[PDB]
Design a protein around this motif. Structure first.
Motif, PDB file in Angstrom:
ATOM      1  N   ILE F 205       0.823  -1.151   0.005  1.00  0.00           N
ATOM      2  CA  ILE F 205      -0.077   0.105  -0.003  1.00  0.00           C
ATOM      3  C   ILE F 205       0.925   1.360  -0.066  1.00  0.00           C
ATOM      4  CG2 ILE F 205      -0.160  -0.118   2.300  1.00  0.00           C
ATOM      5  CD1 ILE F 205      -3.008   0.921   2.038  1.00  0.00           C
ATOM      6  N   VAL F 206       2.020   1.310   0.803  1.00  0.00           N
ATOM      7  CA  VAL F 206       2.867   2.318   0.977  1.00  0.00           C
ATOM      8  C   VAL F 206       3.508   2.615  -0.517  1.00  0.00           C
ATOM      9  CG1 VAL F 206       4.881   3.595   2.023  1.00  0.00           C
ATOM     10  CG2 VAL F 206       2.936   1.994   3.240  1.00  0.00           C
ATOM     11  N   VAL F 207       3.997   1.543  -0.973  1.00  0.00           N
ATOM     12  CA  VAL F 207       4.436   1.514  -2.409  1.00  0.00           C
ATOM     13  C   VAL F 207       3.719   2.188  -3.243  1.00  0.00           C
ATOM     14  CG1 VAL F 207       5.354  -0.181  -4.498  1.00  0.00           C
ATOM     15  CG2 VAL F 207       6.339  -0.345  -2.052  1.00  0.00           C
ATOM     16  N   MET F 209       1.316   4.333  -2.735  1.00  0.00           N
ATOM     17  CA  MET F 209       1.152   5.460  -2.433  1.00  0.00           C
ATOM     18  C   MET F 209       2.219   6.470  -3.094  1.00  0.00           C
ATOM     19  SD  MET F 209      -0.786   5.327   1.358  1.00  0.00           S
ATOM     20  CE  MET F 209      -2.383   4.844   1.654  1.00  0.00           C
ATOM     21  N   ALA F 210       3.413   5.748  -2.841  1.00  0.00           N
ATOM     22  CA  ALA F 210       4.448   6.518  -3.246  1.00  0.00           C
ATOM     23  C   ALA F 210       4.663   6.506  -4.626  1.00  0.00           C
ATOM     24  CB  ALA F 210       6.042   5.913  -2.873  1.00  0.00           C
TER      25      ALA F 210
END
Ligand SMILES: CC(=O)CC(=O)SCCNC(=O)CCNC(=O)[C@H](O)C(C)(C)COP(=O)(O)OP(=O)(O)OC[C@H]1O[C@@H](n2cnc3c(N)ncnc32)[C@H](O)[C@@H]1OP(=O)(O)O
Ligand SMILES: CC(=O)CC(=O)SCCNC(=O)CCNC(=O)[C@H](O)C(C)(C)COP(=O)(O)OP(=O)(O)OC[C@H]1O[C@@H](n2cnc3c(N)ncnc32)[C@H](O)[C@@H]1OP(=O)(O)O
Ligand SMILES: CC(=O)CC(=O)SCCNC(=O)CCNC(=O)[C@H](O)C(C)(C)COP(=O)(O)OP(=O)(O)OC[C@H]1O[C@@H](n2cnc3c(N)ncnc32)[C@H](O)[C@@H]1OP(=O)(O)O
Ligand SMILES: CC(=O)CC(=O)SCCNC(=O)CCNC(=O)[C@H](O)C(C)(C)COP(=O)(O)OP(=O)(O)OC[C@H]1O[C@@H](n2cnc3c(N)ncnc32)[C@H](O)[C@@H]1OP(=O)(O)O
Ligand SMILES: CC(=O)CC(=O)SCCNC(=O)CCNC(=O)[C@H](O)C(C)(C)COP(=O)(O)OP(=O)(O)OC[C@H]1O[C@@H](n2cnc3c(N)ncnc32)[C@H](O)[C@@H]1OP(=O)(O)O
Ligand SMILES: CC(=O)CC(=O)SCCNC(=O)CCNC(=O)[C@H](O)C(C)(C)COP(=O)(O)OP(=O)(O)OC[C@H]1O[C@@H](n2cnc3c(N)ncnc32)[C@H](O)[C@@H]1OP(=O)(O)O
Ligand SMILES: [Mg+2]
Ligand SMILES: [Mg+2]
Lengths: 260, 260, 260, 260, 260, 260
Positions: F205-207, F209-210
């Motif tokens: 999820i963070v990947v 978003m980035a």
């Protein structure tokens, strides 16, 4: 001069307003190439004149401008269109730094409406009508009939007019925000000249700066637009007209602008 | 509070509204540096109170705000304007995360109208009048008078007001889109406070998110704007107020938001 | 086909209009996953039909669409929302190349309003009401409720609606520019179908080009938008419908377009 | 022609290239009003010849162009610059439909760099130097020295050059992305003419379309840019050169483009 | 001074450079709230000082800045982040009107890189290292790590650094466009101070105008950016430093700027 | 599955990488309709798989992708291209939320290059060559060949590549910013798979978003981009992977992300 499609004259008290009347009653002021060239010449003449502070563009009582001359663009090809840039001559009003007021009387259809949309202020007659009938001839508005119209009257009405070609009255145009004022058919040009006089009575440099600041609203974001407005406001302090106006406000009297 | 130019007080049942009334009837609420500093202080005091959810900005019944103090900017050079970053304080109003309602009564000219335009909601009185008379003093707006105005009333009316300085009526401002409601002169402030109450009764975090999503419409394209709106909608699911309200709706009861 | 939440049919003489009526009276046309899937299926079916030139989207007489199904998003988490990309099915309407007319009757709240805002032309009934009650349930619009509404009715009224959830009448929607025409509750769908017939009576390729040109007004600056419009206008000359329409105009006859 | 500041001649085999060499070794090719007028005239001449497909702009082996004539703008006032628009004539290079290659030898400072940045391709000599010394004379770049340079070399090096005026070598200009190819001093012009031949050997219409598509990258978002590129790609199919080249490739033969 | 996290000094001949050195070696110059507050105070002090023309930001020999304090942000929550608007104080660097040079020595990870990217010019040491390891701790950059980095090093390298957290050498940053010069670890600060002196030797008003014009490249299209640059160029003529420098050059002498 | 033009497999330790190899040596991996459909199917399969965290796109040792199949588009007309919305199937690669690494070997011409430009990271072999030969067949790129290339390698080189059809080596592509790393022809795929593993070893999820934040750099202004990055950084706090990673860092241990 010897203009066979338009009549350019210096109207208004002190000859401060420039009136360009499209004179082609046999074609409802069809915007042919020659007419566009004459209009550009008149605009250049009025812009380079230090006395004219504002310009007024109008047509006949029956039709302001019926749009481009379909008879000329009938046999045009895609290669010809892309090579000659047919409608590049039309975007000369957008370069005129002096304010231009459009006195729209009667039919303002297609290019004509677009022409009226290229001006800064639009005064519509009681019986004026605006439409984009390009869709009815297998063509789309190609000189600002979708961008400015959509930005002014919104997506819904713009889409309706562009896809159906239906006409809107002066009242609808004023309610949607396309035109600012509605005037009688017989006094439209007179009120337009009065507004042009009111405009030209101010400093021309500040008028041009304000025109640029207002036009920037459709080209930049709100933050960058506000920053450009701030920069122009700072620059206005370098002119003598600003000091004169502020002194005439502080000291109770009228201002005398020298256009510098 | 020891305020000499403004009066800031908590209003509305439960004291959830913040009312800041400009008090300078001798200069028609001229926006001087000290007045703007007091306004920013009042805003920061209401923006940090966990009880105030909305703010209401108003002036006098005769004039909301006449604009910047010409007597102060008279002997002002371009170098001074550029070095001091003149008019910076005026932008602080745009940084307030809480909704601000502008109750405009009487004259709202120049910097005043911009001030009203810097708020989220504008309620105008029946006799209220808006204008941009900067052109009459040899200057142009510098706090969004040509950016926010053009984006609400169209190019025609904005250009006319900026180049002529003519005053528009509250009905015209509402038909164009500058104001949302026309309230009586004797009940304008009461209805504004009631609207501020209605706004503050919701989740403050969600109110701020909605305000940001609406403001983003003037800074980003429609596609990126919609993507940011969808991201904010996803983010709202991290708060407990959303679940509380949804469970209250599904259970047919009242929602008690906790502002988190 | 077998649809449980909607009804898709071909209306208008010659079977040229695609009518999609949302059928869920027990939930006031709540936009659930199945309803959106059926709507997308119907839109794809009508877009791939060479006889359908325009689509008409409508609901019930009491409510067009109340919004998303709160019962389905009650127990949704932030991680679930971001992993599933909720509401993306709703953007399919924005990918329809053919014009879509929204016939809004009764309540158009939340997503429903956004649905109407995703269409090209919005026809509202005399008793139709538009609102954004998301703030009342602890959430915000996520399908253009703060982007298109703000661009349509301005900053003031959009902010008011989004932060208070109050309803606006069809008259207010038309005065603000959200809707184009108001029709009786009994003839709304009939007038919408009649307008869709006029729309479809034109060249489909040219209609799509004009739709793209109008949509570009919300994604590019005025200069680049006008340049793209000019490029599309030049491209229209490659189609035979343009030449056919121009010859019919010059010959003073009806144009028989062939969609090429 | 009787040009006195520049030399314009047809170069390359079959006279397919146009070469404009700035001839003013007494002022390091200072960009005066007369030199700019002659350059614009030569460009217009080469832009209207159906034989010239590309233009090569070059200067002397010691200096390409030292920028505007400081001796002419020394006594110019703010009002004078605002009214006459001093640096407007320079923008003609941006309106050239045909590609223009800049052969930079020696000093390319201030305007000379901006001029080189206004071209599509820049070939620099082994000992060529670029700089923005405006800051050293109390002014800033005014013809794109801060927009194109920043987009090309980045924020860091652009800021450094603009705030210090330090010179960068052709190697550091290629490593930063400003220059595409570095050539010997005595062979720069010949290689530039060979590149111009390679460019002009293709269909001029598709060349101009590709130039416009590449220029659009700095005027709109990536999504709208890609959409405009796709529209231009679709439009290319209306030309005959596209099918001719595709058939020559499918048949493994040479393509004979006819500029249509 | 009474600072405890940073050292603020006036360096360079005539004390024209402002040096801010992070002095938290026990945490690799972790950007805590107190350190950021002290940095903002020092920046305000150096900006209000008329003798300081440029500022130099540096850290330790082993690490310039390790980014935000992971220990302080550990127990933070989404609600707290949204209510306090975490990292807003970091944007003060973007508001400094005077040029800031970043002397990056050693590790510049996460925020430390973003801080370096917030300055106008970045001087990196031979052993300097830039990276965005936020992804390694379950968060993304939040101070321009994905916006400024991508606009300088390209999409590929920015994506790689952001998703993998890998480090890039000073030579890689110089070849990409993140840093403009590489200096020995022993003379980095000295060369940065020399560059700051060379910058401050010019008129401060024109330096600020040029900095604004350069920053404008990342906020608007090329056309509006060039128009703003031309307007700022016109405005520069209202200052006395422009005329002073032009006369000093025409008379073949050195210019004496008085910052007016 | 039974793919006739591609080979999709789960590579890397723990089967965390998705390798899609284009198998069509007879046509140099010419991108045809069936090949693009199979590629989209494989991309969707790898995106829906919860184990694959990253995807690696590669071709053959002699050519990555020679572009679109000219054999099919030979007889295509403008009306066909417009009605069918040609090449839209190629944009699906940009809709993949998971990161995609492009391993380029040998010829990457036209569409192939665009394909490589549609991925997030590009790894090129020592003998890889990038070119845009669309000009040599009478057409222009139609999948971002002029937008992404211009944004990556600058205007000076993009114009040359697009107007001459020249080939740039992997070294030049890396020096300009089109590729981020150069690897031997025999170890390119292995290093790409290792990078894909390094990427997939983080919170998905963070990947995503980035990746979204990085992509936003080419669609919004710097200020709005930074605000969206701040919003995404605030939203990351709602996930559990953020807290887990931050605690692992504070406790000096390896983080165990749960992808939530
Ligand atoms: C590129 C662009 O953006 C603009 C365009 O493509 S053109 C689109 C907008 N204009 C149009 O569609 C054309 C106008 N169409 C009409 O139907 C009408 O003429 C009208 C509604 C304006 C008035 O209708 P009307 O009152 O019945 O008068 P009508 O008899 O048709 O016109 C009088 C003359 O003007 C001519 N005329 C009208 N509009 C014209 C036009 N746009 N171009 C050339 N001639 C035109 C008529 O052909 C006719 O000439 P003839 O003497 O040869 O018969
Ligand atoms: C973008 C910016 O920030 C820059 C700006 O806004 S520039 C300011 C633009 N706004 C204006 O010019 C509006 C002020 N102009 C006016 O013409 C009038 O004052 C008015 C139409 C608002 C009122 O008309 P009125 O009813 O006849 O009352 P009037 O006698 O003029 O004013 C009352 C007092 O307020 C003062 N005043 C009014 N407006 C003022 C202003 N903008 N600044 C300073 N003083 C002002 C008057 O000078 C007068 O003061 P005195 O007691 O010393 O005489
Ligand atoms: C942008 C997005 O995608 C996200 C969103 O839109 S959020 C949704 C925003 N929409 C709303 O908040 C709904 C508006 N609020 C309401 O209170 C009302 O439902 C209404 C005003 C539409 C109708 O008022 P009403 O005449 O009193 O009828 P009402 O009894 O409330 O509703 C009839 C039925 O529809 C249901 N319903 C109405 N709106 C609904 C909705 N948005 N979702 C799910 N169910 C809904 C009711 O629960 C009720 O069902 P039951 O048989 O279980 O009782
Ligand atoms: C805002 C804009 O966009 C407009 C601009 O470009 S502003 C101009 C910015 N560019 C410059 O300032 C560069 C010119 N400045 C210089 O210092 C130097 O001439 C140089 C760095 C180019 C090195 O040249 P040099 O050979 O060592 O010295 P120099 O003897 O001065 O040059 C030869 C002649 O050209 C003249 N000249 C050089 N550059 C000139 C210029 N931009 N304008 C006018 N004349 C110039 C010299 O004055 C000198 O003329 P004289 O015969 O009268 O002495
Ligand atoms: C606003 C933004 O966008 C930025 C952010 O949100 S998050 C910041 C992203 N930056 C980082 O993650 C970098 C920190 N990560 C590291 O792996 C390492 O500290 C490093 C590679 C920088 C140094 O490696 P090293 O030479 O082995 O030194 P190391 O022992 O780890 O650190 C020294 C001390 O500084 C502390 N420290 C290091 N980086 C820190 C940071 N970003 N924040 C807080 N403290 C930090 C360490 O905890 C450490 O331990 P103690 O203080 O308790 O003794
Ligand atoms: C959507 C877009 O943006 C893309 C576009 O619009 S157009 C496509 C742009 N790309 C190209 O033009 C490159 C292809 N052109 C070429 O000239 C060459 O093939 C090349 C430069 C790649 C070098 O190839 P080479 O080493 O000499 O071997 P070559 O014999 O030409 O090719 C082998 C086979 O692939 C075919 N082929 C190569 N490229 C092809 C393509 N783009 N389309 C279809 N077939 C292609 C060849 O025709 C040949 O097939 P045959 O068995 O029928 O002979
Ligand atoms: Mg309106
Ligand atoms: Mg680069």
């Amino acid at each position: 001069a010897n203009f066979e499609y338009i009549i350019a004259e210096k109207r208004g008290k002190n000859n401060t307003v420039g009136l360009i009347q499209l004179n082609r009653p046999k074609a409802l002021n069809a915007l042919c190439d020659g007419l566009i060239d004459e209009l550009n010449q008149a605009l250049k003449t009025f812009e380079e004149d230090p006395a004219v502070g504002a310009i007024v563009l109008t047509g006949g009582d029956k039709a302001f401008a019926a749009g481009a001359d379909i008879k000329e663009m009938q046999n045009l090809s895609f290669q010809d269109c892309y090579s000659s840039k047919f409608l590049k001559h039309w975007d000369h009003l957008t370069q005129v730094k002096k304010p231009v007021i459009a006195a729209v009387n009667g039919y303002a259809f297609g290019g004509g409406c677009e022409l009226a949309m290229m001006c800064d202020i639009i005064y519509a007659g009681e019986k004026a009508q605006f439409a984009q009938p390009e869709i009815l001839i297998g063509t789309i508005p190609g000189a600002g009939g979708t961008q400015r119209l959509t930005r002014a009257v919104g997506k819904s009405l713009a889409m309706e007019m562009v896809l159906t070609g239906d006409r809107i009255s002066a009242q609808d145009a004023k309610q949607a925000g396309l035109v600012s004022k509605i005037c009688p058919v017989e006094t439209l040009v007179e009120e337009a000249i009065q507004c042009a006089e009111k405009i030209a009575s101010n400093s021309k440099i500040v008028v041009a700066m304000a025109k640029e600041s207002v036009n920037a609203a459709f080209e930049m974001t709100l933050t960058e637009g506000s920053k450009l407005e701030k920069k122009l406001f700072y620059s206005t302090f370098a002119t003598d007209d600003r000091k004169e106006g502020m002194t005439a406000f502080v000291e109770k009297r009228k201002a005398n602008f020298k256009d510098q």
